[PDB]
Write a protein that binds this ligand. Structure first.
Ligand SMILES: *[C@@H]1O[C@H](CO)[C@@H](O[C@@H]2O[C@H](CO)[C@@H](O)[C@H](O)[C@H]2NC(C)=O)[C@H](O)[C@H]1NC(C)=O
Ligand SMILES: *[C@@H]1O[C@H](CO)[C@@H](O[C@@H]2O[C@H](CO)[C@@H](O)[C@H](O)[C@H]2NC(C)=O)[C@H](O)[C@H]1NC(C)=O
Ligand SMILES: *[C@@H]1O[C@H](CO)[C@@H](O[C@@H]2O[C@H](CO)[C@@H](O)[C@H](O)[C@H]2NC(C)=O)[C@H](O)[C@H]1NC(C)=O
Ligand SMILES: *[C@@H]1O[C@H](CO)[C@@H](O[C@@H]2O[C@H](CO)[C@@H](O)[C@H](O)[C@H]2NC(C)=O)[C@H](O)[C@H]1NC(C)=O
Ligand SMILES: *[C@@H]1O[C@H](CO)[C@@H](O[C@@H]2O[C@H](CO)[C@@H](O)[C@H](O)[C@H]2NC(C)=O)[C@H](O)[C@H]1NC(C)=O
Ligand SMILES: *[C@@H]1O[C@H](CO)[C@@H](O[C@@H]2O[C@H](CO)[C@@H](O)[C@H](O)[C@H]2NC(C)=O)[C@H](O)[C@H]1NC(C)=O
Ligand SMILES: *[C@@H]1O[C@H](CO)[C@@H](O[C@@H]2O[C@H](CO)[C@@H](O)[C@H](O)[C@H]2NC(C)=O)[C@H](O)[C@H]1NC(C)=O
Ligand SMILES: *[C@@H]1O[C@H](CO)[C@@H](O[C@@H]2O[C@H](CO)[C@@H](O)[C@H](O)[C@H]2NC(C)=O)[C@H](O)[C@H]1NC(C)=O
Ligand SMILES: *[C@@H]1O[C@H](CO)[C@@H](O[C@@H]2O[C@H](CO)[C@@H](O)[C@H](O)[C@H]2NC(C)=O)[C@H](O)[C@H]1NC(C)=O
Ligand SMILES: *[C@@H]1O[C@H](CO)[C@@H](O)[C@H](O)[C@H]1NC(C)=O
Ligand SMILES: *[C@@H]1O[C@H](CO)[C@@H](O)[C@H](O)[C@H]1NC(C)=O
Ligand SMILES: *[C@@H]1O[C@H](CO)[C@@H](O)[C@H](O)[C@H]1NC(C)=O
Ligand SMILES: *[C@@H]1O[C@H](CO)[C@@H](O)[C@H](O)[C@H]1NC(C)=O
Lengths: 148, 162, 431, 197
């Protein structure tokens, strides 16, 4: 502490004694229900951006690892939380908002973004936390004469 | 946000923005009508709440610091405009300091010029002296702080914890 | 640089130098008492009219409250300093209508009825000699607060102190004001510095003329020198410079795109505008904390100066001080307080010995096998005759038993000389 | 009465309280709790958030230490003054006006107080003053007599010499007066007899 090999006579404050923890205890709700992520991510038809579908997720234990295991999701961007830390946390106010937009409008579904659908269709708050998932749906949400 | 007024500043044709000593935008020029509008920030000031204890009363008076009374029991002081206190000619000792010689007290809340002390004209002459014929042994108290609380801070544990 | 003029003192084992005249010297001492009372609106200074900036500023905690509390403490401290220095008497004394004090003239220090401000000529000169920047400072949330005691009330306190020290001497500072004629008061002050009353009474007109001349020289010296009032003006300059620097710091980008918050809001989205506003907030907050820190250090310095000024007012004005150089250069007689912007000026009236003359000195006089020592003076010889005189003025008197005391024989004292010691009773019993 | 010492205690506690309050400030980060940042954010962004908390808390601690240093300087000055009062008012009699109480100082008594000292200053205050006619000198036998230690006072018909701070009239004799010069120089000299023992 004094940066010397000779210490003069006196009392010196060096560090702080603190007793270390002996073991780690994790307390989570006992209830285990597989969460219906299949319904939201594997649906055949999605809603329009003006009438975007909101699904409430509650009273389930969520395994986000399977989301990673099977995933054609070109974009998987999270804002207020780490993607790899989702399995270790507990949440409420969980909502899945599903809609279909253009390929170049995926940047606009974010807090503070400038756009047409951002202003008149779907608005995010500035303090939004969560993850935006975007994936191509040419195989299912397109038709050759024009899907309107 | 401000008040736009007429200006007498001879702007040069290239110039548009007008800047004060602090680089604040004193004036501006408009493209649609080529006229110079002086920009002045809107009226503002500090509010001071003069109050006695809540044990005694709940009446309050407000002092607008450095603001004349026409831009806000109204009394005009050099400190500002005092609302809620009535000026009293009678001079008393200072109870709640207002400023510029003005003090406030509760008796309603009154405002007055603080009294420096009692007048005492000493009878000076060329041949007269005053001699004491008695004395008083006066004991007075003087309170002086000597030490403070000795505090130690663990910098690492305070900023970072564990 | 030269330290001083070279002087060699003529030290010898039996020579003394005794003053034969005096100079009444009045000197000026300028002490700062208070500073400019400043208040800062923390939210308006850092953010102005921007609500988003205030919302982001709230995340930093009680920094604004700390700065306001510190400035409020300084502001009340300045008023406390003025109360401590000037409000030391609870009776407002007034001078008699006939301004005759035994030849002493106090026109330059007493209040002038002709002036609306009710100040003395010296105080009026002091106020005159100490003096859109203000608009920008106000518009940026910084406000100067008025002093609690107005200049006229501070002048009234100085007038009361002058009236007490002139009509009552030092009695008013230690209890009730007891009237005493001013020559008798000056004789008491002469006794305080070790000079007999007769020296003051015999030379009363000369002392009054010297005092009047010194007061006139003091007024001319203050009116003719620009750097006389540098301390008070220096304090005013530091306060104004600090406010100007704090206002100037708002034009600093602090690593952001612009120094104007409205431009940042008008040009960027909230995710990046929040970052730019954060950079501006941290820079402006650092500037404001720096300003408050220097204000606190200066407040401590001014508090020390005010405590010194209060000590000088108590010991030099309200009494006669035996402390060397505390109340002027020379043997201190009395002091006069004068109000000045943010400060006090003490006119120290001191006694300076002059026109010294050499004499031959001895520690004791040997008479009838006994050693005689001076009761209150010193033995001097003009060459042939021995006399006893007071130490601070040359007034030779015959060596008698009344002014000398006998201790021992003549064999122990080193340097004793032989001389006769007169007896007052000797002509009486003879006749 | 004892507000000054209480103020010192209050300021210290207030400063500590404010410093603890500073831990509940986000300082522009997502959370004020380090554990939340560690659990919710990956290390790349976690380092930035902890950096924001570290700089804000360090600034708060620096501010607190600076305030403590200024207050320590003020208390050191007060303690030096208190030591000067202890030496000059308690351990001796002081002739300094108003240093050891209002009035002519006689003695002082120290009393311990929390974080401070209380001095009981015993002073002498003159009272019950009376007017007298005064003169600078007494003219007797063509000589001017001046008081050795007192002042000449007259109650209307008779002249006496008394000590300046208490009325104790004594007859004007050659033992309490000294002669310097004749009666022609002193302004205001009065004619009165001077007794010879
Ligand atoms: C000494 O005598 C003077 C008068 O020469 C007294 O002064 C007067 O005091 C009364 C009562 O306080 C006042 O109403 C007068 O106006 C005073 N006269 C003047 C000229 O000021 C003084 O009080 C006497 N002192 C004592 C101790 O009795
Ligand atoms: C000096 O003042 C003291 C008090 O300060 C006087 O003592 C008082 O005398 C009266 C009558 O003799 C008593 O009723 C009081 O109780 C006494 N007070 C105290 C504290 O003892 C004293 O008489 C005064 N002397 C003169 C000469 O005026
Ligand atoms: C007292 O006597 C001494 C010596 O007799 C004087 O000192 C001399 O002063 C002159 C003039 O400045 C110098 O040139 C000499 O060198 C000094 N002599 C010594 C030995 O120092 C002194 O001036 C006399 N004092 C007065 C008041 O006349
Ligand atoms: C003491 O010094 C004073 C001056 O400080 C002398 O007074 C001067 O006397 C001369 C001639 O006697 C005059 O020309 C001057 O005008 C006087 N000056 C003042 C200010 O009055 C005084 O004579 C000196 N006394 C002794 C004994 O040396
Ligand atoms: C006291 O001093 C003042 C000034 O120091 C004297 O006033 C001067 O009086 C003369 C003659 O009457 C005038 O020529 C000057 O102009 C006056 N000076 C000022 C500044 O007014 C005053 O006469 C002196 N004596 C008394 C008794 O007051
Ligand atoms: C020292 O002082 C004494 C007394 O002042 C002087 O003695 C007087 O001198 C004057 C003029 O020389 C004579 O007229 C007196 O008669 C002397 N008086 C006595 C009692 O003798 C003495 O001359 C001074 N000595 C010197 C060297 O100046
Ligand atoms: C001062 O006086 C004493 C006594 O009158 C002197 O002492 C005498 O000195 C002479 C010569 O040295 C001797 O013969 C005597 O016996 C001494 N008498 C005594 C009682 O001691 C002394 O010398 C004188 N001092 C001076 C400087 O003249
Ligand atoms: C001033 O005081 C003196 C002494 O205290 C008074 O003189 C005495 O007065 C009393 C009563 O009048 C007489 O019995 C004495 O005989 C006087 N003494 C002498 C030596 O004559 C004097 O009366 C007082 N004067 C006033 C005006 O009160
Ligand atoms: C004090 O006494 C002296 C002397 O006894 C008085 O002086 C005399 O006054 C008369 C009248 O004016 C003159 O004729 C004499 O020539 C003076 N003599 C001297 C030696 O000066 C003086 O008048 C008395 N004063 C008072 C106030 O009574
Ligand atoms: C997803 O839906 C397809 C039909 O659209 C189905 O064949 C497949 O089994 C579903 N996958 C899951 C995991 O439910
Ligand atoms: C429109 O603006 C131009 C300058 O930009 C100005 O010369 C012109 O007079 C304006 N037109 C009207 C109708 O004010
Ligand atoms: C003595 O005082 C009176 C009034 O107090 C005054 O008129 C008179 O002139 C004074 N004496 C002298 C010699 O000036
Ligand atoms: C007196 O002083 C001189 C020089 O000033 C010195 O020579 C002499 O020795 C001294 N007298 C004694 C007795 O020492």
């Amino acid at each position: 502490t004094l940066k010397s090999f000779t210490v003069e006579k006196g009392i010196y404050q060096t560090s702080n004694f603190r007793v270390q923890p002996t073991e780690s205890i994790v307390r989570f709700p006992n209830i285990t229900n597989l969460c219906p992520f299949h319904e939201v991510f594997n649906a055949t038809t999605f809603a329009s951006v003006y009438a975007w579908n909101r699904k409430r997720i509650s009273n389930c234990v969520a395994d986000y690892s399977v989301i990673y295991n099977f995933a054609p999701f070109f974009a998987f961007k999270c804002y207020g939380v780490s993607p790899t830390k989702l399995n270790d946390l507990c949440f409420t106010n969980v909502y899945a908002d599903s809609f279909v937009i253009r390929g170049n409008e995926v940047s606009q579904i974010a807090p503070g973004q400038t756009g047409n659908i951002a202003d008149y269709n779907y608005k995010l708050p500035d303090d939004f936390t969560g993850c935006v998932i975007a994936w191509n749906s040419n195989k299912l949400d397109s038709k050759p004469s024009g899907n309107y | 946000t401000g008040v736009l007024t007429e200006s007498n500043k001879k702007f040069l044709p290239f110039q548009q923005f007008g800047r004060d000593i602090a680089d604040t935008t004193d004036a501006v020029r408009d493209p649609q009508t080529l006229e110079i509008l002086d920009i002045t920030p809107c009226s503002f000031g500090g509010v001071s709440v003069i109050t006695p204890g809540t044990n005694t009363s709940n009446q309050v008076a407000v002092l607008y610091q450095g603001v004349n009374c026409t831009e806000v029991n109204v009394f005009q002081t050099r400190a500002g405009c005092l609302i809620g206190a009535e000026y009293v000619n009678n001079s008393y000792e200072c109870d709640i300091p207002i400023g510029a010689g003005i003090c406030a007290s509760y008796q309603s809340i009154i405002a007055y010029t603080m009294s420096l002390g009692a007048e005492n004209s000493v009878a000076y002459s060329n041949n007269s002296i005053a001699i004491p014929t008695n004395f008083t042994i006066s004991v007075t108290t003087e309170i002086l702080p000597v030490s403070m609380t000795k505090t130690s801070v663990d910098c690492t544990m305070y900023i970072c914890g564990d | 640089m030269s330290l001083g003029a070279e002087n060699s003192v003529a030290y010898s084992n039996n020579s003394i130098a005794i003053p034969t005249n005096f100079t009444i010297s009045v000197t000026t001492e300028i002490l700062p008492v208070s500073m400019t009372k400043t208040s800062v609106d923390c939210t308006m200074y850092i953010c102005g009219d921007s609500t988003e900036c205030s919302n982001l500023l709230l995340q930093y905690g009680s920094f604004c409250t700390q700065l306001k509390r510190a400035l409020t403490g300084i502001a009340v401290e300045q008023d406390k300093n003025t109360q401590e220095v000037f409000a030391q008497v609870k009776q407002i004394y007034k001078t008699p209508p006939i301004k005759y004090f035994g030849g002493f003239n106090f026109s330059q220090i007493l209040p002038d009825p002709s002036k609306p401000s009710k100040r003395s000529p010296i105080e009026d000169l002091l106020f005159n000699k100490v003096t859109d920047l203000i608009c920008a400072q106000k518009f940026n949330g910084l406000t100067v607060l008025p002093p609690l005691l107005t200049d006229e009330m501070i002048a009234q306190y100085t007038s009361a102190l002058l009236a007490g020290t002139i009509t009552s001497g030092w009695t008013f500072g230690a209890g009730p004001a007891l009237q005493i004629p001013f020559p008798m008061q000056m004789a008491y002050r002469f006794n305080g510095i070790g000079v007999t009353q007769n020296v003051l009474y015999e030379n009363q007109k000369l002392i009054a003329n010297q005092f009047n001349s010194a007061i006139g020289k003091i007024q001319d010296s203050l009116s003719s020198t620009p750097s006389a009032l540098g301390k008070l003006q220096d304090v005013v300059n530091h306060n104004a410079q600090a406010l100007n620097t704090l206002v100037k710091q708002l034009s600093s980008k602090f690593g952001a795109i612009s120094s104007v918050l409205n431009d940042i809001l008008s040009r960027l989205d909230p995710p990046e505008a929040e970052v730019q506003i954060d950079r501006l907030i941290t820079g402006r907050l650092q500037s404001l904390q720096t300003y408050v820190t220097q204000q606190l250090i200066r407040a401590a310095e001014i508090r020390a100066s005010a405590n010194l000024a209060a000590t000088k007012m108590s010991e030099c004005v309200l009494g006669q001080s035996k402390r060397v150089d505390f109340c002027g250069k020379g043997y201190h007689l009395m002091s006069f307080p004068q109000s000045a912007p943010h400060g006090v000026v003490f006119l120290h009236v001191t006694y300076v010995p002059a026109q010294e003359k050499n004499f031959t000195t001895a520690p004791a006089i040997c008479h009838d096998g006994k050693a005689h020592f001076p009761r209150e003076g010193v033995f001097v010889s003009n060459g042939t005759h021995w006399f006893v005189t007071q130490r601070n003025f040359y007034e030779p008197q015959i060596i008698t038993t009344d002014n000398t005391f006998v201790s021992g024989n003549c064999d122990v004292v080193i340097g004793i000389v032989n001389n006769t010691v007169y007896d007052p009773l000797q002509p009486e019993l003879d006749s």
